Amino acid sequence: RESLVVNYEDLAAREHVLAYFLPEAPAELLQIFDEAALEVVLAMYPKYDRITNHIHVRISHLPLVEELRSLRQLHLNQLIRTSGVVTSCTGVLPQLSMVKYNCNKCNFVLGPFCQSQNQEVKPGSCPECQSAGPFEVNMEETIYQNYQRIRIQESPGKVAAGRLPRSKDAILLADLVDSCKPGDEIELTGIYHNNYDGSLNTANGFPVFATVILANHVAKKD
Amino acid sequence: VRGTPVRQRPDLGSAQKGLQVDLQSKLVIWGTDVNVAACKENFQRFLQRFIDPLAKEEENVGIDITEPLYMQRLGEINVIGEPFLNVNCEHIKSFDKNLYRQLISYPQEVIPTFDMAVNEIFFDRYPDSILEHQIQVRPFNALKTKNMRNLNPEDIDQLITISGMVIRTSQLIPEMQEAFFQCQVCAHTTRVEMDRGRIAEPSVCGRCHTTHSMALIHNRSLFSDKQMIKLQESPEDMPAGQTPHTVILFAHNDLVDKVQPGDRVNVTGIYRAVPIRVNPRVSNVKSVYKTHIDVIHYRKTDAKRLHGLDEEAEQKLFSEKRVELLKELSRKPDIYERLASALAPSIYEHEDIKKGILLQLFGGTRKDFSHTGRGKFRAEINILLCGDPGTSKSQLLQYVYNLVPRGQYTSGKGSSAVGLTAYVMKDPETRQLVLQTGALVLSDNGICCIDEFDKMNESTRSVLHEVMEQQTLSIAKAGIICQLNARTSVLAAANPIESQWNPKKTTIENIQLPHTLLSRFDLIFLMLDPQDEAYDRRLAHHLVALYYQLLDMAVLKDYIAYAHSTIMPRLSEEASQALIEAYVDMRKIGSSRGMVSAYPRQLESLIRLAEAHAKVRLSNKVEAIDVEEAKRLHREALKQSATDPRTG
Amino acid sequence: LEVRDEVAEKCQKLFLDFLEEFQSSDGEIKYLQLAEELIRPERNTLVVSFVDLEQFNQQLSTTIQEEFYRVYPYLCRALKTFVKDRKEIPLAKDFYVAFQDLPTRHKIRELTSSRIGLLTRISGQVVRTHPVHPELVSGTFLCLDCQTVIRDVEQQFKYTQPNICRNPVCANRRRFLLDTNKSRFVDFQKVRIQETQAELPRGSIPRSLEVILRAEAVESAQAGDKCDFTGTLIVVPDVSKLSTPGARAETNSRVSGVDGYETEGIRGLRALGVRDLSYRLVFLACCVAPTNPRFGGQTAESIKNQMTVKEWEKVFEMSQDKNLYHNLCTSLFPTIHGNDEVKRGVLLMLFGGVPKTTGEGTSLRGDINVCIVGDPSTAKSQFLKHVEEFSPRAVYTSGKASSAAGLTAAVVRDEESHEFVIEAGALMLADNGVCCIDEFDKMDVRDQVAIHEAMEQQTISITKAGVKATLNARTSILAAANPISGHYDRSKSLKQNINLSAPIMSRFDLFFILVDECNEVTDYAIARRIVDLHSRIEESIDRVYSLDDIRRYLLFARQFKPKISKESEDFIVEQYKHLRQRDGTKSSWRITVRQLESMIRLSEAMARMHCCDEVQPKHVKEAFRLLNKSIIRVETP
Amino acid sequence: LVKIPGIIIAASAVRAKATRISIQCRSCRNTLTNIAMRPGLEGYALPRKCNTDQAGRPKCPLDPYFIMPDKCKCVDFQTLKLQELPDAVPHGEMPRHMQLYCDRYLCDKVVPGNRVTIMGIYSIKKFGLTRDRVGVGIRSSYI
Amino acid sequence: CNTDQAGRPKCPLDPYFIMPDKCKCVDFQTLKLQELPDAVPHGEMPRHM
Ligand SMILES: Nc1ncnc2c1ncn2[C@@H]1O[C@H](COP(=O)(O)OP(=O)(O)O)[C@@H](O)[C@H]1O
Ligand SMILES: [Mg+2]
Ligand SMILES: [Zn+2]
Ligand SMILES: [Zn+2]
Ligand SMILES: [Zn+2]
Ligand SMILES: [Zn+2]
């Protein structure tokens, strides 16, 4: 399953300092937890390394649960818990994870560049011919990861008297794809995220930023 | 000049070089023959020495005729505080033809000289007056251009006057006038005024001498106001085959929001031709130029229409002598008959119909029911005419349309629901989706004349229920949902079934209109044809004398405007009792089979007609005579007398 | 030497003095007590009364009003210092100053350019509200030519890069990289408002403009509400598709292109930096309040607390007032004679029942729908207009003037982001309220289907233009219907008289028939009432309770959810048996279990009207009587 | 290599995809015949410099090559839209889709409506690694 | 290239060649000048321009 679910309640009960650190710096703490869990599972079953060579630590039972209407810039880059109903869910697209390239000027295979969720990895020169030539992805050597884009809106039952439900986009990566369906009632724990490419830097536009939620954990309620 | 700021005039466009050329080897401006000094002196002479010989006291209100007209205007300006001097181009032409020609052909140059002259005179006199800005002179009444499409390119960038109808008015466009730059290093601030439509940015700080550190702060600049007026020209010279013309006008900083849709105006402004960019994102411009009018002066006055809402609202509209004359006319015994006979002098012996039309023009008493929580009450008078296509019903509708301001016309199936209420169109000058009004909304505070009301499909006919009941129009479409106001008076004309009133059928079936629609009308006139030799001979002589060809329209306009402005009739006790009795009797008579029944809507119709008659008499108090006239009119129209319980 | 804005600094000092010295009647520092609450997170605005400011220092208030835009940042910094020297708020936290109670109010038509940048207050009707996106207020850029960091460059309602790299020997004016982790953001919402009905001139569309709500004002205005926004008219640059050249900005440096690089055409424009100066008026609202607040101060206790002492005393008096039923009827419809049953039905509609959801999930409707069918000129439209004017969240529409999109909802795409905004329709604006459909019969089936789905499942499902949503529409329906041929026929059934679809008719809780009986007594009474109304306009109306009091009482009572006791159950079943026996002459429409459901809802509405915690046999009896009277007999020769 | 069942709901016209191209320099007119195009949805970045500059000291420009059409070995290629089997779509769900690229003799082999089984390479568009679409590192997949 | 392109492929990056026939050339001479021997300080190498 390549995934390990850890209760935030027990995490705070045992090691509270990390529990406090987690919402403020979700990306870094999650990466460190990923590496630690990978090492522990390798020690338990050394033969497991040949399966995806990567483990995802999901967090459950986050104490503070916000609401889609109550997400403000104050929450950026923090692990927030919300609930909602999926309105749209695109198909499971394949995303670049450790991308390798072909220099289409000498055919050398530029090595594996880790693909981040916020910036399109682009190489510089070719280490062999030192050319900034076009380059092109080498799909045979590249290793991908599942990417699903869902939209979760406020439950109409939870919407107020005079109000329209608000919707937030979320990204499921490589273990959560197709873990929810349009119409499902889901709790989403994820990083309210802003710094990928979303900035209306075009004319006739206020400098507002689009936002998404890097889903770190999903729990259907049914 | 008294140190008061000289306000920039966007209506004159971006300034020019103002280059001067000596015509000898006198000192004209390049490309013109204006001679700013001579022009200014001549305009001062005109302003201080113009007397209109054949003027009339009625025409000029609050102005001593013998004293110089525009000097009195300057006195009024000093009294009030609005630095706008409206000057008549016909007066300029009469005083000096050459000055008039120079003003017409070179407005952008001549007008500022007039501003200078007027300010010099006005501060040489009244030297202690306070004004937010110098005086601006607005010429108008130029030699009327009959058809705006007779204008050749050799008439570009010059003053013209056109007559038209306001179709649409855009939102306010903030036009920059003084950019405010601030250094992002040392915060030194400077201001750059519009040079020729361009703002030359600092490019270097005058404080720390850093290059390209001065950023333009948008909301600390000085801005102007601009508005786009889509006006459908109403030319009086119409050649064969030419279609209606729509023209674009631009109003600047004080004429913004001075005209609403449906308003018929005479606009005086500069005929401007401008390039059009092939794309919004490129600076290439098509070799063909599109023209538009930069507005200088609105004129809401017309000699062949009633007085507009703004004119009536303005207090100093009538002289005391004119007010007393109108009061005398109201004091006459047969003022109602006199006004009715004045209406439509070319149509013979429709006394009751013309009385109904007169009451429609006068309207009822506008009442505020907000506290009651009852909803607006229609004070307008709705009239239906019924008769074959041999009577003057259509002529009456055309006369009302050509008479009233804010008069819209519709006929047969040439209209639709969306085209009568509102729709959405991509503005073909800003490429934005703007909402456009229908005929009913365009005639908001006026009259909609609907000919051939019978041959009008139910989809468009059903809209009139809301207009004639609530005076509102609740358009609830995808983009925006809003309740427009259409306080219009309906003048409908419908034909009988089988296009003739067959005496073998009762009135209701001959009319062929729903009970609800007929009840929404407060007057119905069955223009039946009596087989009377006397009537036929009188009408024949009338028509032949018309072919081989009074109460003046001016005093008619004045009477109606005065009545609307001041008279606000209220119900007296005797009128209230008379109305109650009249409604009960009307219900009793109309409870027959084929008669047009009566409802509380008919009671309200009687109330409105009584208020209208009170206005006609300038009573300011509704009473028994008014109620009796309302009842008699509502009976004679629809001919309750000639009918019987066995309707037919 | 970083030239100082002396006027703004003086304003800042004076405003800080006002904050730290001004006191209320009690004599304590009211704004100190208020700023005590600013320490908590998700709380970064202080509300200050312009009345208090003017009282403390008239010159300061006038300066702020006349130079609001330029001085506002200094006021914010003053508030920041005021909070800091007291408490330990985070160093990076920003504070904002909202102003309220501005004495003067302007009109959206009067929002001219002369009002740009100076404090103002306007009244508008919210059309739609966009989502809450972070906005860039000041970003720190990196130069891609020399890696110099240009720090704290302000954003003027547009993505603005540094005008020039700081490094003197580097003229980079294009290649900058924003540093998001170093930039600061503020909450941002764009809400489209339009001119109110009163302000409309003759023959004009309501002018619409968008207002910008910053932090702490970002979800206070909702579509359809009447709200007063206080802030500053501003201009935001726009790339407008004007076919004609207009105002342009270019450098004053007198450069010229050499042969082969002639500064002409697109190259010349790009070299001179020619850029069009096109602006559009936008409103930057620092605060929003309801135009006509319901309470001077969402459960029953919360509403009670929100009420003032006088308001709650009045509500309690009305609740304790026996005959409150008739009193409310008369107050709501003082100008309508007769039709006591219709008035009672409309009142019970305004109050509503208790919606429920079964264990299986079925949503039992809780709000009642009323349809008035009658002869022409019988006050059906007047009832609809009365309810629209009185009730909040009371929308009105005609039979055929609205489309499906304009009657349920529509979808547009957020012009400032990737998300989708939902333009609410009439049935959404009437959510948790009333929708008044006049000429209900004259509506096309394409819209009757939408209305039926609304009345059926209390929701509107929209799948359009790239978005799917399920809006909630818990709106009661007040319909006005003309009988076929215009005049109701007493010898036929209701279905034969009206042309409403059977599914539509079946779920109308109450159907009131207004037959125009030509009776002398009623004629005289109605004539007297009408003539009295037209003679004594402002007087002649003596409603024992004002509309505002009734609205407050409705808002308080709606929070009550009456129970149903066993005695009430027994009485209900007995009354249903009696009504069924009535059904067994021929009624204008049969009696099914839908009549029992309507009666239960009416009993709940009566209990809620009296604010009782238990449905009582008196309420059940009143509901049964109303329903029985509504169901008329079909008289035939 | 993947074998999947589906139903073709569309089939684009059959067009010409080049398998070989001959590019000629504008200055010296020298050619670079027979450049092996990759198969599938993929493009080719033309050489920026005329390598045959040794025939004369004066040099050819930058980006000098024009593709010569008449010297291209083209083949039939077609685009089809496969839709999941209706009996395969779970109860409450949407039909998944896929894009099919068909070659010389796979063109017009099937028509809209046919229920087919496709054996092919699961590949992503490779066209130069360059409001909506907030994702990064995502390329149009196809079979 | 300045030429107003008519939608064709644009001219190359460095398209310009000198037209020696269409040039106006003038005489130009380079001279060496030396500090006058008397003007040179006693112990000093002469300056050159
Ligand atoms: N019973 C009544 N009490 C008070 N006013 C009435 C009554 N009946 C009719 N009216 C008046 O007559 C007019 C007709 O009412 P309206 O709502 O248009 O009826 P309908 O719905 O049949 O069109 C209204 O202006 C109303 O004030
Ligand atoms: Mg009605
Ligand atoms: Zn290489
Ligand atoms: Zn500086
Ligand atoms: Zn730099
Ligand atoms: Zn070559």
Side-chain angles (χ1 to χ4, degrees), chain B residues 509-529:
Chain B
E509 61 179 346
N510 227 330
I511 285 161
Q512 172 252 327
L513 288 167
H515 284 102
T516 58
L517 207 302
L518 281 183
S519 69
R520 262 63 193 270
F521 276 84
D522 50 63
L523 272 182
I524 296 132
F525 289 74
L526 310 184
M527 307 180 74
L528 254 297
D529 183 5

Side-chain angles (χ1 to χ4, degrees), chain C residues 183-440:
Chain C
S183 309
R184 285 204 331 279
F185 331 95
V186 67
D187 293 311
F188 171 100
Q189 194 189 64
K190 185 177 74 177
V191 309
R192 177 76 62 173
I193 62 163
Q194 63 170 356
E195 207 170 356
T196 53
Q197 173 65 346
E199 297 183 356
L200 261 74
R202 63 182 181 278
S204 299
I205 314 308
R207 296 274 176 78
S208 64
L209 68 77
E210 64 278 45
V211 352
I212 311 306
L213 315 181
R214 290 272 174 84
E216 272 284 11
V218 77
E219 288 206 5
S220 296
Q222 300 302 332
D225 298 1
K226 314 291 198 309
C227 288
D228 270 323
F229 309 88
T230 182
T232 150
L233 186 69
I234 62 173
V235 299
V236 296
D238 74 330
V239 48
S240 187
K241 309 182 180 183
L242 265 300
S243 301
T244 304
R248 32 184 274 189
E250 55 190 15
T251 54
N252 64 347
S253 57
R254 312 303 297 183
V255 305
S256 183
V258 300
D259 309 337
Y261 286 101
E262 293 82 346
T263 181
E264 296 262 20
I266 191 178
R267 155 164 281 283
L269 298 171
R270 204 171 59 258
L272 297 187
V274 173
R275 69 206 201 88
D276 286 359
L277 292 170
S278 293
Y279 293 96
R280 57 186 173 89
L281 291 163
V282 172
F283 200 88
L284 172 51
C286 71
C287 200
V288 191
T291 293
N292 291 322
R294 295 283 155 267
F295 319 88
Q298 292 293 352
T299 187
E301 295 292 347
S302 62
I303 294 290
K304 175 228 70 61
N305 285 322
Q306 185 175 0
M307 310 215 72
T308 65
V309 180
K310 184 285 312 179
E311 289 169 340
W312 187 96
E313 289 294 350
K314 183 62 182 174
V315 164
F316 174 90
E317 173 272 336
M318 290 197 303
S319 69
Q320 299 297 276
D321 160 61
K322 298 174 183 176
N323 197 265
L324 168 61
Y325 201 176
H326 192 291
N327 282 334
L328 280 171
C329 288
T330 47
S331 60
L332 266 162
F333 307 95
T335 185
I336 290 298
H337 167 241
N339 299 332
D340 307 332
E341 305 300 331
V342 182
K343 297 162 178 172
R344 290 174 217 281
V346 175
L347 188 156
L348 295 181
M349 185 218 305
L350 281 169
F351 273 94
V354 179
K356 299 164 215 184
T357 66
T358 53
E360 62 190 357
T362 316
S363 63
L364 313 190
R365 171 175 52 156
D367 58 354
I368 67 182
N369 293 312
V370 183
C371 184
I372 278 63
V373 59
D375 286 70
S377 181
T378 322
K380 320 185 285 292
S381 305
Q382 290 305 146
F383 268 99
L384 270 58
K385 295 304 305 189
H386 278 58
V387 179
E388 186 209 6
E389 297 287 9
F390 157 80
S391 166
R393 308 241 76 193
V395 188
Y396 174 91
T397 181
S398 184
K400 79 311 193 184
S402 66
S403 304
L407 192 60
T408 45
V411 163
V412 182
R413 55 186 63 187
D414 185 0
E415 289 70 26
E416 315 300 348
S417 176
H418 71 259
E419 309 192 23
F420 283 94
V421 171
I422 299 156
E423 170 65 28
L427 274 95
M428 273 307 316
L429 302 195
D431 176 15
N432 213 24
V434 175
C435 183
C436 301
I437 306 107
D438 195 54
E439 307 292 326
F440 184 43

